[PDB]
Amino acid sequence: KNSKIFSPFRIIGNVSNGVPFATGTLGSTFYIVTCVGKTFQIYDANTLHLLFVSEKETPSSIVALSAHFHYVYAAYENKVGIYKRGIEEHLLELETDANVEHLCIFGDYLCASTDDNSIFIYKKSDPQDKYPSEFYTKLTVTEIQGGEIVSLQHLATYLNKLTVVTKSNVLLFNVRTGKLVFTSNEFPDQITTAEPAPVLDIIALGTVTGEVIMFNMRKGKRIRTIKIPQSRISSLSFRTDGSSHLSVGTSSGDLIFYDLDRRSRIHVLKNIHRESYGGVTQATFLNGQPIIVTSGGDNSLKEYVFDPSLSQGSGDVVVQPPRYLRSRGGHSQPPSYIAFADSQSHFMLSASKDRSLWSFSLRKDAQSQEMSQRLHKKQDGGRVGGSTIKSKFPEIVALAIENARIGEWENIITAHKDEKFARTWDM
Amino acid sequence: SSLSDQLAQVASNNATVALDRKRRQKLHSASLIYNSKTAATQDYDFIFENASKALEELSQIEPKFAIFSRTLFSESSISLDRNVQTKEEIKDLDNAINAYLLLASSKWYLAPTLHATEWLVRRFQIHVKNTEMLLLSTLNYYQTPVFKRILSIIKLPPLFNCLSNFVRSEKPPTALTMIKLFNDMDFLKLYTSYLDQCIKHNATYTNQLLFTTCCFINVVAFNSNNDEKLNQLVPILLEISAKLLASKSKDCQIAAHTILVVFATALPLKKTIILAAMETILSNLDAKEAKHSALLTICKLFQTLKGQGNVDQLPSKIFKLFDSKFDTVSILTFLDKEDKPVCDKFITSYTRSIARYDRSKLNIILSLLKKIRLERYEVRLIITDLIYLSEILEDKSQLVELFEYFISINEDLVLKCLKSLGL
Amino acid sequence: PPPDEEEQLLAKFVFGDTTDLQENLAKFNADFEAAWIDSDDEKIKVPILVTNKTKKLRTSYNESKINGVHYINRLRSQFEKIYPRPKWVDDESDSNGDINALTKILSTTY
């Protein structure tokens, strides 16, 4: 069904979908790989400017995403795509009929996992090679050792070991020998998230319920655990800027910063993402920075900042709350109506079903802004008849706009859903 | 960053070092007793002589300053300077001045303390090295000229902006500015650090205690309109009252009692948090006035809580610790007190708790019911679980005497309750 | 010949020695195993002088190969150099009424 006149290029107004992003660095610059449907994007992090896009649309949606230094590892329907700057340049077909569920990179051993608990270990063709092309071995965790695979982690200072966190326990596999070298104890709560701590041999397991348990694989022992009931831990990250702090992003769109040394709650952040779209679908600290990237399923990718402590003596006791810093976002619904704004093909207004209308930039998307819904004051000075609380306007079923006299009076007319009247808008 | 901010940061690095005779003069005229001219034209040996005399007088008062006259008040303490030493040593010096101020924080209106603090200001430059700690030490004395001089000579951290407005004035700072300082949130975290330190060192007294307790009642007072600010105020102030009750002192226990009382009558709290407050109060309750004020906190807490599960009974551990720490005769005397506060939900819940657990002091329950005036739904709950306890337990003479008291006063509710549950 | 104690005090007085005060100041304050192993990872022995990161990891100029045990030991040591071990994990482990019930309820309830 390919065309001779046109050719698909990319998508505007979408920064996330619910798929967790992956962070990476090229020395000092940091880039973020976030999936957009059948495609992924690569943003900058110091400015959130766009770096790369996937040039080739994968025939399905990318399920798993990860990244080392200069190679991005996607997993759509059955294969691992290894791209460089978004350029489709290696495909890695697994030998299954299942769908690739998990994916992780460590050294000379790629570890994928298809949904029938089937781990695929691939070896690099050379130590100087850049991506795995050779199929090393194929492991599978049957139902007796543990539950379904929750995570494929690679803990620091472990010779070819892979932490298969399952639903019931934690397994350690030597991918060189293909052998399960350690089975952990069974945990009474189904693990949903696993994240390696900056301390040695210790993982955090955020289960169905609020119980971030600091488990040590050496002792085979749950050293610690943090109570945080009625909440599904959807992300865990560690402050690596120089302070013992943990961010727990629940599925309720919430974000909780704990200080571990005082064993206290530094801070809470309510409704940073929308629960119906999953809430906080991914939260990651910047490595060695007090900057936190929080992506939700609501087509939102925020980047908050911690300020340094203002107390001259206390510091981490009187530590600063998060300050709102730079974010990217778009519609939560598909766009209903669209319009261009000028002849230069530089801006497009987009009205969607979430009653929020957005001017997206076109050259570089750093100008994706919601049009302000804030009333001008009436000329008669009388009262306005309406509810005390605020709400957005109905979905835009008709629209017109001109640019003859722009910045002079109104230039957009929007006929909303089932109104005997049409609202005006200044671009 | 901008070069102005970089040079300002390196100036804050190079603050306490004198780079010329004028800046040396400014830091030498920075004093606590003398004015600028004589503070210029006097000498470290004179100030140290008066300082050693002042600190040996303080040693005569209490034996705590002997170690500081041994270490921080020596000829080496004269000949030493801060910038010529290393970071480990300057940290140990900060700890030593911290211990000294935590000891001398309770004699601020005394001239030997003024002289010793002035010598430490002009020698160890504490008024530019640790300012937050010094202000948290002598903050309770804001109506004093010694604190006014502290203000007029201090370089202020960026949090005390009310005192930055009130600096270099002839009037002492105000109670409103105190309410605003304690209304700032991170100042309360600095004060939680201070309260943790002074609780761990047991250097507390009634003036500072009453002062910051009044600041807390007035901040929750001005904040009685904003629910989210009150809710974010819950953890700090509750940790304060928790460690204040963990402390053994009766004054700190009564101050924490007042704090929980005002926070409950400003904020309808939760049942499990309220019962944990009763648990901690009952665990660290030791003295007589603490017991009386704690009984008042029990009554006020159980009255201010209202909802589904309003008059639910006390559990096993809580009720058993309640009868262990309190006497039926003491609470009977409290009911016989003429003031008669509204202990309605507490008394009903306590009677239903005894009816579940003990089933022995039915005479005591009878005296309670005839001493305090009750309310219709509470007596309804009493008649229901009393009918249930009469059906499980053997029919007792004092039990039917309670029933006959109900006949004398409102048999009709007993009739309605039996028609709903029974014959 | 060792010096006398009076001569040492006079030498402190004539020199301006702050070492005794430094000792008092630094002294006086506030007086009021594994569960599993791997035999292949034990018998493994890796080269050292192939890559610059292991050229950092080594300890001897002449040593070119070391076993997996000493390799992972130096690896965890340089991991310690990168990230120091903090107190909440190094020295903290969880494993009449109580007094910290408010603290526990405050940690568990928002």
Binding site: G27, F106, L159, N287 | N161, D186 | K53, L75
Partner: peptide
Amino acid sequence: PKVVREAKKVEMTEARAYNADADTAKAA
């Protein structure tokens, strides 16, 4: 005057990381 919280610019400094290529080694 109340306590000012003037915002400021941020900068992502150079970050150090671990080498999984150093962790994963070939067998003897």
